Amino acid sequence: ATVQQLEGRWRLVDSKGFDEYMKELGVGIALRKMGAMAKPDCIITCDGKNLTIKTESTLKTTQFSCTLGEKFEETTADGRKTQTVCNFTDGALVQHQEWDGKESTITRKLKDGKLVVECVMNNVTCTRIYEKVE
């Protein structure tokens, strides 16, 4: 498994636990409803150690870029400003966020040709499955 194999445009086909993960983050109702109903595409690009992830939908689009292994300020969809680090480790892209004494991890991995995105904060989890599209 390599970080490059995650590259491309992917479209959301299934979600579980997302609303509860947003509740654990303390996301307010406006943003939770938009999350309930955006069916985004996730676009992953990686050039050596440079990574960009763009999550795109008519409701909401976010994008960040980083260097793998280097701490950076991420503005999240819900407007947190986190200190994030992304690494490709044990065959998954692991995005670790720390802010105001709190932490959350988002992992992205290939499983059976699908992109599986898993979020966790304080044992509250979400799992989102994306299929590779043109």
Ligand X SMILES: CN1CC[C@H](C(=O)O)[C@@H](c2ccccc2)c2cc(Br)ccc21
Chain residues that interact with ligand X, rule: CB under 6 A: 22, 27, 31, 35, 38, 40, 42, 55, 57, 60, 62, 76-78, 106, 117, 119, 128
Buried b (16+ CB within 10 A) or exposed e, 77-110: bbebebebbbebeeebbbbbbeeeeeebebbbbb
Nearer to ligand X, 3 or 108 (CB): 108
Least distance to ligand X, CB of residue 130, Å: 8
Q: How far apart are CA 81 and CA 117, in angstroms?
A: 21
Q: Known binding site: residues?
A: 42, 108, 128-130
Least Cβ distance, residue 32 to ligand X (angstroms): 7
**Structure token digits, residue 66:** 């980083």
Q: How far is the CB of 15 from ligand X (least distance, A)?
A: 7
Enumerate the known binding-site residues for N-eicosanoyl ethanolamine: 42, 108, 130
Closest CA to 44 of 127, 120, 116: 116
Q: Which residue is nearest to ligand X, using beta carbons?
A: 77
If the CB atoms of residues 48 and 58 are measured against ligand X, the closer one turns out to be 58
56 Cβ neighbours under 8 A, 6+ residues apart: 40, 41, 42, 43
